[PDB]
Amino acid sequence: SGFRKMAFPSGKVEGCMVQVTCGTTTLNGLWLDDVVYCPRHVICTSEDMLNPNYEDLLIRKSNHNFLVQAGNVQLRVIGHSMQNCVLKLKVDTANPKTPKYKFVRIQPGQTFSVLACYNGSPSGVYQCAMRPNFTIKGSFLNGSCGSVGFNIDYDCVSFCYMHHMELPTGVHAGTDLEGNFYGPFVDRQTAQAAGTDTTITVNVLAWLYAAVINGDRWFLNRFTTTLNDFNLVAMKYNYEPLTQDHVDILGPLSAQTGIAVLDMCASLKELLQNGMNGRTILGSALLEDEFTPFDVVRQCSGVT
Amino acid sequence: SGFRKMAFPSGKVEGCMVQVTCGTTTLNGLWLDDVVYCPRHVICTSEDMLNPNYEDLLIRKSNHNFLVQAGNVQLRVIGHSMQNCVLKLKVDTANPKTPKYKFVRIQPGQTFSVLACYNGSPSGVYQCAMRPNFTIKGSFLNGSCGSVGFNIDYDCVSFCYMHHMELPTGVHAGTDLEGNFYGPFVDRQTAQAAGTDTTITVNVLAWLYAAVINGDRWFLNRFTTTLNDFNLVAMKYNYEPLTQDHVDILGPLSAQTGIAVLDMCASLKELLQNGMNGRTILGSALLEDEFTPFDVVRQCSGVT
Ligand SMILES: Cc1ccncc1NC(=O)[C@@H]1CCC2(CC2)C1
Ligand SMILES: Cc1ccncc1NC(=O)[C@@H]1CCC2(CC2)C1
């Protein structure tokens, strides 16, 4: 019993973190096999950030200009290429600690763990969600660029995020491991609109099931609703519209608890319309949307 | 910018986790040097749990009865001893992945990361606080016993907690690494009173400083208070009384922000008396007490 915002064990990712320096900028790199991946803005200076011409800046760099250090040992760079917003530094040594891994592009609403790093060293790990507007609300200071987000299925690490930018609003933006930004963002020090965000409805429902499983039941009511009626409420409260695909993914939790998905929707509807009335659910005084239905099943059954 | 409930990177602890089986019970062990530490209740059966005679149960066991498996390799047990509520299994091989470590007994109100494990395998990591009443609100299912809590200062892991029990209330209890329970708890399946808990005042203040540093300032007011006046409010709201030692520990945050500790206390006083009025602070709709002043300084400065 108990339900926590759990991150994946970060060990497999810790063994991939390196420091990448180019000129006066130092940030983090991800060393997998004989390739080090890092944000391409490692090649910029202060005068560049407003609108860097990355192609031109990269042309003035050679393999020997990229200083890559794994803990205390230096890696020899034998190639460099820019793919979208990431640099790929080919090194002469394959990382002995390379885990089984994949590069995946996550969907908005999905969750992942971030290993925050500075100068190639891990500082901490936390779980978060990719917002519906493709931003993340992380904890990143200058030097954290290149820190990655990932998920782990048994022995395979699926890398889904690499940190690149802090928007003027204090929210975070980054790319998949092929250097494609999530969202409309560009890697430049410019004010950039993040779309209107919404609350991840399917995740709040998953978390309400986690609450029932762990004893927090006060919010269960005698009502039901329909997808149409619920979606009118979700519209008013800036919640993502619920679809049958979302209901289908909540199936395991509905089956375990015996509470029909539309009945749980009616509980969520009443919580949106009436608030928590000074009460809490799983130690929170707000509706938590950072747990997917998969996260709830995994945590509630002790999957390692 | 941004402030998250960050756990320490768990890699150094992951390399110490082993599976310990004795009879029909399997749980987690911590392998450091040539010693495996685990809860002594691994030697119990269902009929024992109500009030196990651990000394008698342990006398019926021999070194060969403790099955210790590190991933896929079996460890040879050459000695066994019970120290308080932990078993120490001497093995013939020192853990090659033993990090620099210490065993520490944390104080109530201090925080630490837990690496939740099942069958010797890590499932996740989360940060929590040792409650003033010596319980922890974790996420532990059957099989998680032996999972540990720790802190990391550069390369040294300070192990402070080993999980033993879930109280009938769903809160968690465990020991230091010498097997001494935190709190009044005994390792038996019996209803056991946890003392009256309180909110960790110094941590809420630290978190209010973290909020100001990251832009959440709406709760700052034109008032001040005294330790005496504040402690009358803290008494009413079941907050720990604030002492000059707590004010002294908040010094770095008071100096960084320019907000005197007693001024921040006046903000906390008004939040306790008036509530949040449907607003949030660092993504929370309640007063968070799971960040120490040290955690706030570390996270706000990117210590690795
Ligand atoms: C200073 C900082 C803090 C946290 N996270 C990231 C950063 N850095 C940035 O956002 C810079 C400015 C724009 C950029 C994309 C090209 C990199
Ligand atoms: C079933 C479970 C779940 C989570 N954490 C722990 C447990 N197990 C226990 O609490 C047992 C019963 C009493 C005990 C101390 C001797 C071990």
Curated annotation (Swiss-Prot), chains A, B:
UniProt cross-link Glycyl lysine isopeptide (Lys-Gly) (interchain with G-Cter in ubiquitin), position: K5, K90
Catalytic reaction(s) noted: TSAVLQ-|-SGFRK-NH2 and SGVTFQ-|-GKFKK the two peptides corresponding to the two self-cleavage sites of the SARS 3C-like proteinase are the two most reactive peptide substrates. The enzyme exhibits a strong preference for substrates containing Gln at P1 position and Leu at P2 position
Regulation: Inhibited by pyridone-containing alpha-ketoamides compounds 13a and 13b. In turn, alpha-ketoamide 13b (tert-butyl (1-((S)-1-(((S)-4-(benzylamino)-3,4-dioxo-1-((S)-2-oxopyrrolidin-3-yl)butan-2-yl)amino)-3-cyclopropyl-1-oxopropan-2-yl)-2-oxo-1,2-dihydropyridin-3-yl)carbamate) inhibits SARS-CoV-2 replication in human lung cells. Inhibited ex vivo by michael acceptor inhibitor N3. Inhibited ex vivo by compound 11a and 11b.
Active site: H41, C145
Reported effect, P132H: In strain: Omicron/BA.1, Omicron/BA.2, Omicron/BA.2.12.1, Omicron/BA.2.75, Omicron/BA.4, Omicron/BA.5, Omicron/BQ.1.1, Omicron/XBB.1.5, Omicron/EG.5.1
Domain Peptidase C30: 1-304
Localisation: Host cytoplasm; Host Golgi apparatus; Host nucleus
Cytoplasmic side: 1-304
Task of the protein: Cleaves the C-terminus of replicase polyprotein at 11 sites. Recognizes substrates containing the core sequence [ILMVF]-Q-|-[SGACN]. Cleaves and inactivates human TRMT1, preventing tRNA guanine(26)-dimethylation of tRNAs. May cleave human NLRP1 in lung epithelial cells, thereby activating the NLRP1 inflammasome pathway. May cleave human GSDMD, triggering alternative GSDME-mediated epithelial cell death upon activation of the NLRP1 inflammasome, which may enhance the release interleukins 1B, 6, 16 and 18. Also able to bind an ADP-ribose-1''-phosphate (ADRP).
Subunit structure comment from the entry: 3CL-PRO exists as monomer and homodimer. Only the homodimer shows catalytic activity. Interacts with host FBXO22; this interaction promotes the proteasomal degradation of nsp5.
Protein name per its UniProtKB record: 3C-like proteinase nsp5
First and last residues shown, out of full length: 3264 to 3567 of 7096
